[PDB]
Amino acid sequence: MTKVLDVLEQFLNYHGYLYMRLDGATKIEDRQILTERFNTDSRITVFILSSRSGGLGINLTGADTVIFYDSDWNPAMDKQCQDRCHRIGQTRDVHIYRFVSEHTIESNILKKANQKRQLDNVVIQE
Amino acid sequence: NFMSIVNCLMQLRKVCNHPNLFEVRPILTSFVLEHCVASDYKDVERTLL
Amino acid sequence: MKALVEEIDKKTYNPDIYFTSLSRPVKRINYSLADLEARLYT
Amino acid sequence: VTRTAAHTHIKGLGLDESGVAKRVEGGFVGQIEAREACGVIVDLIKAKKMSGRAILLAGGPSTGKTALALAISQELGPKVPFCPLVGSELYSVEVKKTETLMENFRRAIGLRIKETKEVYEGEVTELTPEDKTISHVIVGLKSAKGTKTLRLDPTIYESIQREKVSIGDVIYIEANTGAVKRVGRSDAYATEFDLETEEYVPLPKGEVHKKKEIVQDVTLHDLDVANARPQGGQDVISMMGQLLKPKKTEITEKLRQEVNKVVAKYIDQGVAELIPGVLFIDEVNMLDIEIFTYLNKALESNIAPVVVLASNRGMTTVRGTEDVISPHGVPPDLIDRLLIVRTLPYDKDEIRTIIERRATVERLQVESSALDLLATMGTETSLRYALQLLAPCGILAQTSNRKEIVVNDVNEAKLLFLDAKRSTKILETSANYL
Amino acid sequence: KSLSLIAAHSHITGLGLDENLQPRPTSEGMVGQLQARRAAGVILKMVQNGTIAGRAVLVAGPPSTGKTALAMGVSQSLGKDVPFTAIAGSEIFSLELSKTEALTQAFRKSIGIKIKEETELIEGEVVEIQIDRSITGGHKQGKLTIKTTDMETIYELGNKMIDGLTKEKVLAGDVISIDKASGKITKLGRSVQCPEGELQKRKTVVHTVSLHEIDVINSRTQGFLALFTGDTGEIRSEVRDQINTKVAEWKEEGKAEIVPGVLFIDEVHMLDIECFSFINRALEDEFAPIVMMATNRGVSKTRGTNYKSPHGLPLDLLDRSIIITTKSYNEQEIKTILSIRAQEEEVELSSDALDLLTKTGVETSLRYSSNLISVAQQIAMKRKNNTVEVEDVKRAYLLFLDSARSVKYVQENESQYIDDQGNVQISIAK
Ligand SMILES: Nc1ncnc2c1ncn2[C@@H]1O[C@H](COP(=O)(O)OP(=O)(O)O)[C@@H](O)[C@H]1O
Ligand SMILES: Nc1ncnc2c1ncn2[C@@H]1O[C@H](COP(=O)(O)OP(=O)(O)O)[C@@H](O)[C@H]1O
Ligand code: BEF
Numbered sequence A: 001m002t003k004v005l006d007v008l009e010q011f012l013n014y015h016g017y018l019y020m021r022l023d024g025a026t027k028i029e030d031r032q033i034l035t036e037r038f039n040t041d042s043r044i045t046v047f048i049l050s051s052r053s054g055g056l057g058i059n060l061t062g063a064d065t066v067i068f069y070d071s072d073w074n075p076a077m078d079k080q081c082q083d084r085c086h087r088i089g090q091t092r093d094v095h096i097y098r099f100v101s102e103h104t105i106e107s108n109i110l111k112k113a114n115q116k117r118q119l120d121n122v123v124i125q126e
Numbered sequence B: 001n002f003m004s005i006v007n008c009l010m011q012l013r014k015v016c017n018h019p020n021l022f023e024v025r026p027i028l029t030s031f032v033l034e035h036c037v038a039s040d041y042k043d044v045e046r047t048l049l
Numbered sequence C: 001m002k003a004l005v006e007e008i009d010k011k012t013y014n015p016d017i018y019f020t021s022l023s024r025p026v027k028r029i030n031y032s033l034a035d036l037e038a039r040l041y042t
Numbered sequence D: 001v002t003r004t005a006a007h008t009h010i011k012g013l014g015l016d017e018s019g020v021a022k023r024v025e026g027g028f029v030g031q032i033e034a035r036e037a038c039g040v041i042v043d044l045i046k047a048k049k050m051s052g053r054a055i056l057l058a059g060g061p062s063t064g065k066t067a068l069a070l071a072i073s074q075e076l077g078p079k080v081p082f083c084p085l086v087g088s089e090l091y092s093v094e095v096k097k098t099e100t101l102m103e104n105f106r107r108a109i110g111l112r113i114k115e116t117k118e119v120y121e122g123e124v125t126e127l128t129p130e131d132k133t134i135s136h137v138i139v140g141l142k143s144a145k146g147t148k149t150l151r152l153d154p155t156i157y158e159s160i161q162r163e164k165v166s167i168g169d170v171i172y173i174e175a176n177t178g179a180v181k182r183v184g185r186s187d188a189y190a191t192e193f194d195l196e197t198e199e200y201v202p203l204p205k206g207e208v209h210k211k212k213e214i215v216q217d218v219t220l221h222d223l224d225v226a227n228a229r230p231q232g233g234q235d236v237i238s239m240m241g242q243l244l245k246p247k248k249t250e251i252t253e254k255l256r257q258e259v260n261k262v263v264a265k266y267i268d269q270g271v272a273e274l275i276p277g278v279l280f281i282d283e284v285n286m287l288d289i290e291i292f293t294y295l296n297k298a299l300e301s302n303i304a305p306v307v308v309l310a311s312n313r314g315m316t317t318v319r320g321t322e323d324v325i326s327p328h329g330v331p332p333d334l335i336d337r338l339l340i341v342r343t344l345p346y347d348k349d350e351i352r353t354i355i356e357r358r359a360t361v362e363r364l365q366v367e368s369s370a371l372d373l374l375a376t377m378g379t380e381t382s383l384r385y386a387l388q389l390l391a392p393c394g395i396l397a398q399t400s401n402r403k404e405i406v407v408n409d410v411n412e413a414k415l416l417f418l419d420a421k422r423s424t425k426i427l428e429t430s431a432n433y434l
Numbered sequence E: 001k002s003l004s005l006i007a008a009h010s011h012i013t014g015l016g017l018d019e020n021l022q023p024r025p026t027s028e029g030m031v032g033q034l035q036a037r038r039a040a041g042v043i044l045k046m047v048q049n050g051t052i053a054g055r056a057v058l059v060a061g062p063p064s065t066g067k068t069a070l071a072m073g074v075s076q077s078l079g080k081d082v083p084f085t086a087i088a089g090s091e092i093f094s095l096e097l098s099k100t101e102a103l104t105q106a107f108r109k110s111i112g113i114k115i116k117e118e119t120e121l122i123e124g125e126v127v128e129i130q131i132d133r134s135i136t137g138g139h140k141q142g143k144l145t146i147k148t149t150d151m152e153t154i155y156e157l158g159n160k161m162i163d164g165l166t167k168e169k170v171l172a173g174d175v176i177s178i179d180k181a182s183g184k185i186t187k188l189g190r191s192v193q194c195p196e197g198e199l200q201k202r203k204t205v206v207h208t209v210s211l212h213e214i215d216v217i218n219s220r221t222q223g224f225l226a227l228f229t230g231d232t233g234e235i236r237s238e239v240r241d242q243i244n245t246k247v248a249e250w251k252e253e254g255k256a257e258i259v260p261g262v263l264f265i266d267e268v269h270m271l272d273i274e275c276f277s278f279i280n281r282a283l284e285d286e287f288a289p290i291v292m293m294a295t296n297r298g299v300s301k302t303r304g305t306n307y308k309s310p311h312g313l314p315l316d317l318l319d320r321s322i323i324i325t326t327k328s329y330n331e332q333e334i335k336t337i338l339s340i341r342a343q344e345e346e347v348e349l350s351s352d353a354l355d356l357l358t359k360t361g362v363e364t365s366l367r368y369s370s371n372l373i374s375v376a377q378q379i380a381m382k383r384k385n386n387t388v389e390v391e392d393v394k395r396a397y398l399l400f401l402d403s404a405r406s407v408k409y410v411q412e413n414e415s416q417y418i419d420d421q422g423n424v425q426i427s428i429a430k
């Protein structure tokens, strides 16, 4: 959800990181230039994405880490998002970190996916 | 229905990543007591004076 | 008790003037032509 | 990671729905009758029907009396107010002990109240004073979703001008209490100066005027002292008022009666809910005769809550009396109003189980021989001695890099640290009052 | 109103008597103590008479034998609008106030003064309010319309009431009250209520104020605040003399009347000798409320002195006072009292359970049974039966100890408990 992009921006500004954000609100012309700027060598360390805006077909290669806040139904598009960094222009190992809370809906979803080998989840309850 | 459960889990997911549930963190100001027990004696004091 | 903060409309509110307000209901009309012309011409 | 101080191994009484106390449950062993009586008292507290009950539990040292007093409060939950206290605390230099006791009584009983507040925030557009007297000010509060103008009380005008705000500074003002606080300059003026100390904040979300419901809890004594003396306030007048009489003073019964009347009026409308609490006094034998004499009348009050007392003494003289002797140092005219709960010493198996549980909560492993030696020591000198010696054994095991307590470690602990009996034995045969 | 859960004296209300001052065997929660009840009724009629003041009456009896109950019943039968001060003896020992000053304040708090003032006021639903700014023709013109059930007219506002009405926001259609003499504005609500008739009416307001409150008010720049904060701090004597003289003039002029209330002091036996000496003089002055005292102890040592005095009080004070003695309760009275307490607490008791409880109370004490009645009920709803049986009473009796049983157990096991010398044994073996 885009309602957490502002939260992430505020958090990074408070922590003083060199960040830069891309989403559906970003203009079309600036998108390619921003992607090129991040992919090229720079001091930017954190890059903020969106599930549907730029998590589909960009060729980001400078980064080495992927962090997921949430993934409800994730057979392929979350795999697509994590492999967006894992492109042919990458020369370093890819580390993927998933953020899941404890005793929450996401924890039960992950447990049921592990029990059912992560085929398809429609109803989650406990 | 599917819409209702979807909305409920959407609210829960909204909570999980950050307390964005409408995020009303009270400012914890003092109470708003206004009886002012002393004020009831104001008329008595004025009449006595 | 007393309200410390009150909503005020700039063009509407004015400290000079304070005004408040709340068989068939019909007001009283004077039908005297002489009275009406006296009011009009004075 | 976690800190344990002679407690926190107890989570509750651990009784059954029929009131039957399990042999081992909730960090407890034995004392089945005492736990059952305490559960009965808990049910009576939850009933809220009758106020003024007074019970005390009498037993030897290290009999779990304070453990029971903590367990009842744990069972009652954080919602019900609980006021721990010690007998020595009643002697205050500032005010007489009777006032302190009555203040604690008022603190014991709580109250839940719900209220709604009006909140205004946004970016300031103009400051227009309306000017013998301090004139009002018209404020141009502007949010991202709306804009309106408000007239402010001259006290609020003084407060906001003391914040040294200007045009374009985002401020926060509470309509109920008149609190004023400026978060910072609006983000629009961020690039105005290349180097300025003042920080910049984004525009507030939502409209300027907001309302919300809060069910915050306030004790009776809290609002009692709120009516008694002034409290904080951003104006200089509030500072003068709360600096005029800084020392606390005893409260007359007239204010208490008025507080009771207004609380009853509040509860009539259903806005407030009353939740009586429990006052706990430890080492009650330390109190004086006059304190007990006043407590006799205090317990007979209609609003006085239920108070629990604890003492470990036999035939002793009541403090302040040269000849009056009564059990537990409580005068006979008071013990009649009291209900006495006996407590009994533990056994070797109970001591061993207690040590086992204490080791488990301490995240330590003890071998069978070491555990048996600790149990024998506890049965030989005192229960508390093994619990105190537990930590040095862990330290010694850490020094020797072993991960379990052995007989050598506990023997070294015995050699290093002496109990009361060995210390007294040394004292009897000493050179110069060692 | 007057919120209260349960009191040890909640059941008793208004004592009990007849037109001939003959106590009934059971009247309004009072059982037994016929002579004591008749003496209390005599004292109550003395107080209601008001012709005689400054007399001392003492209440004596064994502990838990109708002593505080008698005072509570006397206070309840005396009714409202009559001062009644009930303070424990240990309350006067204040760190910031002298004992003599606290005693004087307690004495002054028990004499109430009624003052009557006549005021004119208008009230009703307000329908129209118009206010204009200053012009050369007129400094301020303001017209308001207050409509009642019977009347609806317009008054003219001469500046000052215009400022008063503009001080607080007032909207048409709400019930307000205006006091012409004081010039203050009172809002009675919104039109929730209904008007009654004429706007202006004649009435008098009566205020009941004690002498102590008058002294505190006249003793400071803002004395009425000290009525609640308790920081009066040794009011000067000339202030009290001036107040007494002014009260005498007011009484002779008919502007006020005095109400000689009652001062009740409990546990007087522990009061200091200086307090008794001061009371000796304070009971012989003009303005002196009736004084009743209750001491449980007998033939003990007066605090502040080495010698032992009978009843714990000096002989001269006893001469200044009249002694009333209460007798120990009997079994047939104890059972009735327990039944009344159970009715007050809404507890159902079986006949055999009641008989066993009465036997236990006779054996040990009345307070023990009056406390066991409530605790047995918790076991009662633990067994989910509304009625309390003998089994529940026996379980409560064994669970919660008595004074005698606890004393006997302490005597048997004095080794485990801490001795007076401080000796104690914690170890089990050896
Ligand atoms: N049934 C029990 N279960 C666990 N610990 C107990 C038990 N009874 C007593 N203790 C321990 O004995 C110690 C002494 O009990 P406490 O009532 O706190 O002080 P004292 O009994 O010396 O006044 C406590 O620290 C408590 O941990
Ligand atoms: N005549 C009575 N009727 C009902 N209850 C009584 C009566 N006399 C005493 N009591 C009970 O005794 C208690 C008061 O004890 P009291 O005799 O005042 O103790 P003390 O003698 O130590 O002052 C009250 O709780 C009341 O329930
Ligand atoms: F063009 Be692809 F699939 F990244």
Ligand SMILES: [Mg+2]
Pocket (backbone or CB within 6 Å): D062, D065, D066, D067
């Ligand atoms: Mg203890």
Ligand SMILES: [Mg+2]
Pocket (backbone or CB within 6 Å): E064, E067, E068, E069
């Ligand atoms: Mg009594």
